[PDB]
Design a binder for this molecule. Structure first.
Ligand SMILES: Nc1ncnc2c1ncn2[C@@H]1O[C@H](COP(=O)(O)OP(=O)(O)O)[C@@H](O)[C@H]1O
Lengths: 577, 123, 459, 60
């Protein structure tokens, strides 16, 4: 490596001297704790180390060395249902060796080196490959796990061992170019694997949560933010999103969060049962969690790990979930490193790197097409936390640029408890001019109007409320008061939802389209009805609205059972009017 | 259709330019064994030393060392390694270490006379 | 050739090396690695003792033993040719399609020198852009500076593209048309999402005007710094096509917001005291030097049309960026956030959109001279309206008297009818017409801004 | 029967388009191939001279 030692210390930072010809940003084992730092500044013989391992009582003179390589992941199977924290280290083992805490400086391998796996070579000796193709599969859960050749690695094949039980350790395929391709390989995180070309959106991505999807859906590539103050769902809706999918694997970060904040999250997972495999849903999930008593800077590392996993799996044909918990952390991180390198921070105190890197973080995801001609798409859904509790800080506001659509939340709804608290006079979508193909393909064409035809309602709900509280609903007439309880239903059976209800736990387009016709009716009937000299009082009392008020209950199977059931009752009861 | 026509043409001209390049490469690689190789030595040797306002010593293949007698008299003399088509040198201190590879001379002129060749060529 | 070694500091896109003596403030140099792969290099501060190099890449794995610089040129110039249209380039300016590196004809500096006012000739032609908004009120004169203010998550791009396909001169009011003119554009962004990208492309091929165009593309994922290089690079591709090749090129800028972002970085990370609200002060210059290039010179058949589009956060026109832009620039057309989610497209409306170049010989003379004053009526006409947007919400359903009722009645009307255009195209006349039709609901004798003839002429 | 008339019209519109779009390629592609060739042939003659010229410049 290179030898040298310490020079001065400042909290998470330390400077080091005598190192020279050293590389830029590396695995820097520092101290006899051996702390993996990173060279941010390279100045003369004087190296800034930058730990991700909590400091305490170092001195001056301890050895400092460095690989001369950045930071990358052991790849292979065994990933699902694993822990890796932010610095890749797998808590599993740690948990065991270190009692009951987290203790810095304890080092282990990441991915296991003892586990056996059946091997099916899909390659033969003397063959020729290309960088990113598959060499062989491995049975992992309900998955065709594959060993994708690393980038810029190709050539003839010297041998191929036949089937067997192995650890990822051995090369099964040594190239006829003298290249022993072991299963895992090294791909530095701060970069992205390329793809043969990129495939593009036109396919909906559903987490199935009603309103969320139905009003402002997102596509399967895409990008979106979540912001709002503490309280409305942010911290925990995401958990819930995981419990359903329109995707395969589920890769979950977490940063700066507290242990209790992710407890259940872990342990419940085996009871969750995906229905797209029927599996116990922990089998396709990833713990990349981070405490909140790590170095500020380890909330950098942590983020990058996720996404770099995502591609790997995605190139293995898959639909990937990344659900970024709080960029605020990350922010703060860099905000701290600043102090160290002493830079005039841009307004509100941040480095003006800011959205530099952010920008790229969003890009990398999406649906693509690989060398292997496989599909897979990365979906990302990021959360934010500005102090005041809204757009009023650049770190949130500029986040709104490099993105697709966003999912606003606000305090006020959180008080009266409407989970989620989306301000539906908030957010926008940016795909609903291109999700219609798949729409009138599964629902049927009468979704592409009628949905919109719900919107008009709440548009017009706004415009009147204003005056309602300014005078009273009283000096307003029937048709006015119409929409008032239209809107009402749009909340009663949408906005108000739970993620605790065994029933509304998962919901779908059928229920969607379902109530999408239900409501329609009242309108269309009543519009004529109140012009039958009828008073809206009475129309409010017509119990059939009350019936639809049980809408969130029909467990979604026997859903057209009750659809059609009450369908008639509408055209029944109202034939009096 | 037009786009295919354009590509085709430009592509083709690329075949041309590459050949012309190749011939230079071939030619430049044939200069040592053209008898004018000692002649060539000091042209470039003097040339680099002139460009280095400092002086220290020159460094080159032992091959071309003989051809140079001039700055075998002058300089500190430390005529070593290989700069091999080109001549290298270093002036005072480690500093800047200005050289003159013949192949870098192609690349220099290329960046210029990319334009001129095309005029000569298609006409 | 030359050859420089002796690093001293690396940290952020700022480099340091001594023993320079004949380096040029702003010079493209190289950065040979040890791995073997070159990186860029600007001389953004030569000094007697050391100097600043400006890494156009990031640095990674970089060392203190093989980091080797080589002055490529003193200044950045670039070649160009006519024949290179439909090709792709990037911030560096290497071709991206895979076809030959261009053969220049003439190289020319990139920073340029500015115009001479004597050499400029006043604008005087305008085009039909296909949306009334502009095309009635503000009048997009040829070779103008028009910024289109938008916010995120608004239809920023789309609307731009429309213009690109409906942009066309008017022979009718003259004797000269596209039987005397072809047409063309040069587009670049400076990094964007992917989603905006492809979307873009499909409107050039289906128009097919792609061929006769130039693309520079930086994608929002390349080294950040090359955000500040790129504009100019393309911008010199404008004069070149304008003056010796002679053309009618629309040049489009979008993502300038992000321009300055990066700008800032070098700005302050190196040093300079910030020159206002978290930005450097020469920001002004840097955004002068970009926009200023437009216009036409005497007797030339070029046309340097700058159309920038960008978005500041919120809608504060007072947020730094559009700020100064305003002074600098000329045009000013706004999206209107409010209109957006009430479904009217393009949401552009005058609420502070306030043109500039209008009076100078278009929308009149050659054009109907029952246009100018039309506009002006409508202007205040709208005023008179919307005032009451508040007063209504204060008094009650109504307490206003009968006449003034009409005001509000035409407001709501106007917006809905007039301002909504589908993928439509309304000719300048088809437009205009409507205008008098909206003047209809106001009785005469309230319209007091246009002569007696005109008023009845088209009532 | 008017729906029939238009339906049939479409046919002709798609056919005329089809046949011709295929034809346009023929003429263009073989002209592309032809001219591309014709610039190679154009080049050949003074190709040499360029090398001579360039070589003379770089050398000292
Ligand atoms: N989607 C929801 N919207 C609002 N509150 C919810 C929702 N789901 C659950 N809650 C309740 O609010 C709690 C906290 O919401 P959240 O903003 O995620 O967390 P915190 O502010 O505690 O970090 C939930 O754990 C639960 O008690």
């Amino acid at each position: 490596m290179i030898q040298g030692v310490i020079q001065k210390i400042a909290g998470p930072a330390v400077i080091a001297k005598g190192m020279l010809g050293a590389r830029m940003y590396d695995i820097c084992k520092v101290g006899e704790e051996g702390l993996v730092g990173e060279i941010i500044r390279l100045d003369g013989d004087t190296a800034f180390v930058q730990v991700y391992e909590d400091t305490s009582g170092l001195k001056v003179g301890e050895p400092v060395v460095s690989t001369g390589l950045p930071l990358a992941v052991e790849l292979g199977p065994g990933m699902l249902n694993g822990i890796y924290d932010g610095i890749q280290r797998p808590l599993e083992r740690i948990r065991e060796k270190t009692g009951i805490y987290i203790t810095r400086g304890v080092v282990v391998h990441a991915l296991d080196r003892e586990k056996k796996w059946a091997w099916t070579p899909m390659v033969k000796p003397g063959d020729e490959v290309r960088g990113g193709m598959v060499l062989g599969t491995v049975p992992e859960f309900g998955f065709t796990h594959k060993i994708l050749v690393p980038p810029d690695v190709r050539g003839r094949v010297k041998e191929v061992k036949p089937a067997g039980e192995y650890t990822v350790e051995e090369p099964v395929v040594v190239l006829e170019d003298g290249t022993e391709l072991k299963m895992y390989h090294t791909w530095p995180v701060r970069r992205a694997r390329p793809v043969q070309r990129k495939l593009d959106p036109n396919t909906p991505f559903l987490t199935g949560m009603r309103i969320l999807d139905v009003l402002f859906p997102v596509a399967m590539g895409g990008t979106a933010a979540i912001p709002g103050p503490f309280g409305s769902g942010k911290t925990v809706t995401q958990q819930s999103l995981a419990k359903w999918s329109n995707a395969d694997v589920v890769v979950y970060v977490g940063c700066g969060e507290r242990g209790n904040e992710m407890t259940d999250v872990l342990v419940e997972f085996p009871e969750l049962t995906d229905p797209k495999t029927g599996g116990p849903l922990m089998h396709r999930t990833v713990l990349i969690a981070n405490t909140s008593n790590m170095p500020v800077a380890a909330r950098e590392a942590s983020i990058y790990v996720g996404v770099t996993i995502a591609e790997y799996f995605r190139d293995q044909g898959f639909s990937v979930a990344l659900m970024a918990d709080s960029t605020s952390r990350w922010a703060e991180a860099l905000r701290e490193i600043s102090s160290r390198l002493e830079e005039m921070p841009a307004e509100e105190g941040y480095p003006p790197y800011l959205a530099a890197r952010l920008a790229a973080f969003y890009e990398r995801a999406g649906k693509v097409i690989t060398l292997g001609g496989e599909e897979g798409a990365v979906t990302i859904v990021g959360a934010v936390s500005p102090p005041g509790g809204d757009m009023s800080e650049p770190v949130t506001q500029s986040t709104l640029r490099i993105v697709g659509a966003f999912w606003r939340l606000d305090a006020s709804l959180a008080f009266r408890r409407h989970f989620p608290a989306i301000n539906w006079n908030g957010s926008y979508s940016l795909f609903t001019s291109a999700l219609d193909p798949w729409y009138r393909e599964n629902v049927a064409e009468d979704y592409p109007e009628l949905r919109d035809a719900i919107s008009e309602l709440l548009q017009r709900e706004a415009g009147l409320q204003e005056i309602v509280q300014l005078v009273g609903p009283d000096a307003l007439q029937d048709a006015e008061r119409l929409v008032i309880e239209v809107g009402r239903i749009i909340r009663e059976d949408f906005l108000q939802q739970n993620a605790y209800h065994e029933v509304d736990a998962y919901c779908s387009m059928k229920k969607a389209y379902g109530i999408m016709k239900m409501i329609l009716a009242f309108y269309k009937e009543a519009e004529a009805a109140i012009k039958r000299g009828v008073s809206i009082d009475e129309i409010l009392q017509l119990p059939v609205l009350e019936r639809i008020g049980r809408a969130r209950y029909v467990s979604e199977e026997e859903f057209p059972a009750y659809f059609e059931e009450a369908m008639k009752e509408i055209q029944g009861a109202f034939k009096a009017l | 259709g037009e786009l295919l026509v354009a590509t085709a043409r430009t592509q083709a001209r690329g075949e041309v330019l590459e050949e012309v390049r190749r011939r230079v490469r071939e030619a430049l690689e044939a200069l040592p064994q053209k008898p004018e190789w000692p002649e060539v030595v000091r042209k470039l040797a003097l040339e680099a030393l002139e460009a280095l306002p400092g002086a220290k010593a020159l460094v080159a293949n032992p091959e071309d060392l003989p051809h140079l007698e001039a700055m075998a008299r002058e300089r500190g003399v430390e005529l070593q390694a290989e700069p091999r088509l080109g001549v290298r040198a270093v002036g005072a201190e480690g500093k800047t270490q200005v050289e003159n590879s013949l192949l870098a001379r192609m690349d220099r002129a290329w960046d210029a006379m990319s334009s001129k060749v095309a005029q000569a060529l298609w006409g | 050739k030359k050859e420089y070694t002796g690093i001293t500091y690396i940290s952020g896109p700022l480099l340091f090396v001594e023993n320079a003596k004949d380096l040029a403030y702003g010079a493209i140099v190289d950065i040979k690695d040890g791995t073997g792969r070159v990186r860029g290099g600007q001389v953004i501060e030569v000094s007697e003792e050391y100097a600043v190099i400006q890494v156009f890449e990031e640095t990674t794995g970089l060392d203190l033993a093989t980091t080797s610089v080589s002055l490529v040129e003193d200044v950045a110039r670039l070649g160009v040719s006519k024949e290179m249209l439909g090709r792709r380039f990037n911030g560096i300016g290497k071709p991206i399609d895979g076809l030959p590196p261009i053969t220049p004809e003439k190289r020319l500096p990139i920073t340029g020198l500015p115009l001479n006012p004597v050499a400029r000739r006043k604008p005087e032609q305008f085009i039909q852009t296909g949306i009334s908004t502009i095309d009635v009120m503000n009048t997009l004169v040829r070779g103008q500076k028009l910024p289109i203010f938008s916010g995120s998550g608004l239809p920023a791009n789309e609307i731009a593209a429309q213009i690109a396909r409906q942009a066309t001169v008017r022979p009718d009011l003259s004797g000269e048309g596209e039987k005397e003119e072809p047409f063309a554009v040069v587009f670049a962004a400076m990094g964007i999402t992917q989603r905006e990208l492809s979307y873009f492309i499909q409107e050039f091929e289906r128009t097919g005007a792609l061929s006769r165009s130039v693309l520079f593309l930086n994608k929002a994922d390349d080294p950040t710094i090359e955000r500040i290089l790129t504009p100019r690079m393309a911008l010199t591709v404008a004069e070149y096509l304008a003056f010796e090749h002679d053309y009618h090129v629309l040049v489009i800028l979008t993502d300038m917001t992000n321009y300055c972002e990066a700008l800032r970085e070098i700005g302050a990370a190196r040093e300079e005291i910030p020159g206002r609200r978290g930005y450097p002060g020469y920001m002004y210059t840097d955004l002068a030097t970009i926009y200023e290039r437009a216009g036409v010179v005497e007797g030339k058949k070029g046309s340097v049309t700058q159309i920038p589009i960008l978005s500041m956060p919120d809608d504060d026109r007072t947020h730094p960026i559009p700020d100064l832009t305003g002074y600098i620039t000329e045009g000013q057309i706004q999206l209107s956030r409010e209109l957006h989610r009430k479904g009217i497209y393009p949401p552009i409306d005058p609420l502070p959109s306030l043109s500039r170049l209008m009076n100078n010989g278009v929308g009149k003379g050659k054009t109907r001279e029952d246009h100018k004053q039309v506009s002006d009526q409508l202007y205040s006409a709208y005023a008179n309206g919307v005032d009451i947007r508040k007063l209504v919400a204060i008094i009650g359903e109504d307490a206003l008297t009968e006449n003034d009722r009409r005001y509000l009645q035409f407001a709501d009307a106007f917006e809905r009818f007039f301002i909504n255009q589908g993928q439509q195209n309304r000719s300048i006349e088809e437009s205009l017409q409507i205008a008098w039709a909206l003047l209809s609901m106001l009785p005469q004798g309230e319209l007091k801004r246009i002569s007696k003839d005109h008023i009845g002429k088209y009532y | 029967e008017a729906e029939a008339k238009a339906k049939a019209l479409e046919a002709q519109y798609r056919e005329r388009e089809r046949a011709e779009t295929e034809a346009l390629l023929a003429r263009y592609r073989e002209r592309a191939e032809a001219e591309a060739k014709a610039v190679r042939e154009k080049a050949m003659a003074r190709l040499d001279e360029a090398v001579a010229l360039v070589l003379k410049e770089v050398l000292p």
